[PDB]
Amino acid sequence: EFARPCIPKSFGYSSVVCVCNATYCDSFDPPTPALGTFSRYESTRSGRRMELSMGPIQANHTGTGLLLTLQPEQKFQKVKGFGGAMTDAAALNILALSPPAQNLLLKSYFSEEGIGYNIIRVPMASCDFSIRTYTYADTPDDFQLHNFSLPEEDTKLKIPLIHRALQLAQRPVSLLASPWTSPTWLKTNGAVNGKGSLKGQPGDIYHQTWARYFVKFLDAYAEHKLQFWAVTAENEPSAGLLSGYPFQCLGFTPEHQRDFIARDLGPTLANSTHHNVRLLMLDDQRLLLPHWAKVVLTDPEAAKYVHGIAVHWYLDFLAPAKATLGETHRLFPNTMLFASEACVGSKFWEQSVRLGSWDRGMQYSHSIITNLLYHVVGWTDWNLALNPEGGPNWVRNFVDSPIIVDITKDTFYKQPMFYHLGHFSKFIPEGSQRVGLVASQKNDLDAVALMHPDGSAVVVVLNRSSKDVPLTIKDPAVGFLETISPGYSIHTYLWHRQ
């Protein structure tokens, strides 16, 4: 409960990382405020890291500058929350630190003294961010799944770390499970990767067996006293449609997904002790919307089992939000939209890890604001931690992560992505509702307004431009916040409307 500042370090990129070790990590002062004043948290490319300041709320405003007006009566989605993924690679990196440094990393993410993550994505067995290739049922032709078992990657690594995150967290934490591959003996191609789907057709022994695997997985985590909020129907089902797909995948067309959900996965979950665990469909690029939503959700047998739609961010440049997220929401407003995976550095021409990249931070916060403005209820980072190479990864498919672990130094680095994510996760608890926010003029800022469950306000303002922008936020209940959005900054504004 002590403020400790960022120990900045440059690696020659646009901004700094914050250096943490066994005895030091940047942290916040204890809560907290007074009515008629606002709190501002600010992070800048120049090096400010979620720094707290306060200001007055005035009764009047005059000027022709930018005005952002809250519309608290204009109510949209409730927020599920924010988090990242406990992959094999993340677990290995976290556990490579000395235990005191491990605790500071886990606190950064999961503690109220950090950034208040309340979501953890858990791969069901191996993915690219694994050093070995395994499923939970590798013994061939085990249709009864008698040899389904959790290996050490779960029992020694992932599960104990998840328990530690839960113990650190004040907020209830939600777990999300997603599979990459089924056992190879359930697959047309008999391999964890490449083009291939489940054998046969939905409703059959292979599909009933795969659905039961999900139940066995939830059974096995429940033995270790962990319960899931949600599962996805498959990670990136389109990937297994692609010739030579280089790592674990399982192909589904949207019709295949529809019918597997309707016949096997939905009923098998609903008839299990795990009937309250929610099912998210898609878990793939938003350009697949609204088409995938139409195929799955217009079939009433599938629709009755689908709680929400999971999206990944990787091809967002191909997929304007209004045409995809917006249209899906219009058509299916009762089916929540959830961002389930994102990372920078995964394009083949990109440097995997750019320590201290401001651009990569702005990419996260711009995606988050844009998602929230188009009805999305949560946003989930990929690997919680990686090494300086962006690994480990058995196919060398290295990417970036908000926290980079340097084993030889018993050190970890919090990147601008961490702080950009924290501008949301720390200040937007589960149950917050996105409300209206209108601009008086054309502007280059990204901004979103939400209402906390206690009625207080939160506004995030991202300035991706080089230019300082003075501005005023109007709340009809309280008054005006006179402020400024510096070039290359992100601010979170908090105030009580009491």
Ligand X SMILES: *[C@@H]1O[C@H](CO)[C@@H](O[C@@H]2O[C@H](CO)[C@@H](O[C@@H]3O[C@H](CO)[C@@H](O)[C@H](O)[C@@H]3O)[C@H](O)[C@H]2NC(C)=O)[C@H](O[C@@H]2O[C@@H](C)[C@@H](O)[C@@H](O)[C@@H]2O)[C@H]1NC(C)=O
Chain residues that interact with ligand NND, rule: CB under 6 A: 127-129, 235-236, 242, 314-315, 341, 346, 397, 399
Angle among Cα 413, 91, 150 to the nearest 5 degrees reads 170
Which residues are registered as beta bridge partners of 62? none
User: What is the amino acid identity at position 288?
Assistant: L
Q: Are 229 and 176 in contact (CB under 8 A)?
A: yes
Q: Return the one option of ligand X, ligand NND, none that residue 346 interacts with (CB less than 5 to 8 A, by type).
A: ligand NND
Q: Return the one option of ligand NND, ligand X, none that residue 23 interacts with (CB less than 5 to 8 A, by type).
A: ligand X
Contacting residues for 22 by C-beta, under 8 A, at least 6 apart? 97, 98, 100, 101, 104, 410
Q: Return the one option of ligand X, ligand NND, none that residue 7 interacts with (CB less than 5 to 8 A, by type).
A: ligand X
Q: Are 463 and 485 in contact (CB under 8 A)?
A: yes
339 binds ligand X (CB under 6 A): no
Residue 379 Cβ, how far from ligand NND at the closest point, in Å?
A: 15
Q: Are 400 and 417 in contact (CB under 8 A)?
A: yes
Q: Return the one option of ligand NND, ligand X, none that residue 205 interacts with (CB less than 5 to 8 A, by type).
A: none
Q: Give the residue with the Cβ less far from ligand X, 21 or 188.
A: 21
Q: Which of 42, 153, 327, 341 is catalytic?
A: 341
β-sheet with 8-9: strand ranges across:
8-9, 17-20, 411-414, 403-406
Q: Give the residue with the Cβ less far from ligand NND, 235 or 387.
A: 235
Long-range contacts of 327-331 (CB under 8 A, 24+ apart): 327/289, 327/290, 328/289, 328/290, 328/293, 329/374, 329/375, 331/290, 331/293, 331/294
Residue 249 Cβ, how far from ligand NND at the closest point, in Å?
A: 9
Which token pair is 443?
């502007």
For ligand X, the binding residue among 3, 5, 23, 453 (CB under 6 A) is: 23
| Catalytic residue flag (residue 236) | yes
Which token pair is 49?
């890291």
185 binds ligand X (CB under 6 A): no
| Catalytic residue flag (residue 1) | no
100 binds ligand X (CB under 6 A): no
Angle among Cα 442, 444, 448 to the nearest 5 degrees reads 90
Q: Give the residue with the Cβ less far from ligand NND, 35 or 315.
A: 315
Q: Give the residue with the Cβ less far from ligand X, 32 or 408.
A: 408
Q: Give the residue with the Cβ less far from ligand NND, 132 or 442.
A: 132
Residue 258 Cβ, how far from ligand X at the closest point, in Å?
A: 53
Residue 316 Cβ, how far from ligand NND at the closest point, in Å?
A: 10
Q: What are the residues binding ligand X (CB under 6 A)? A: 7, 21, 23-24
- What are the residue numbers of the active site? 236, 341
